[PDB]
Amino acid sequence: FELLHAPATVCGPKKSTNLVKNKCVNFNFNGLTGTGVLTESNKKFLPF
């Protein structure tokens, strides 16, 4: 392996837990951490 100045391309995660909903817990969404109540939203998002 090499650790030069370049973006990391290959690495594999491991399954830890299952999905949870509608109770205020901490989450790790694509490297973003936060805690909140998850509620379904009717807003339409852009595809990107």
Partner 1 sequence: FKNLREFVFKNIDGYFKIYSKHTPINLVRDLPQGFSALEPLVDLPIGINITRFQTLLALHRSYLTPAYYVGYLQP
- Positions in the binding site for partner 1 (CB under 8 A): 5-7, 9, 46-48
Closer to partner 1 at the Cβ: 31 or 36? 31
Closer to partner 1 at the Cβ: 29 or 48? 48
Closer to partner 1 at the Cβ: 11 or 24? 11
Least distance from C-beta 34 to partner 1, angstroms? 23
d(CA 36, CA 40): 13
Q: Dihedral of CA 6/9/12/15: which sign?
A: positive
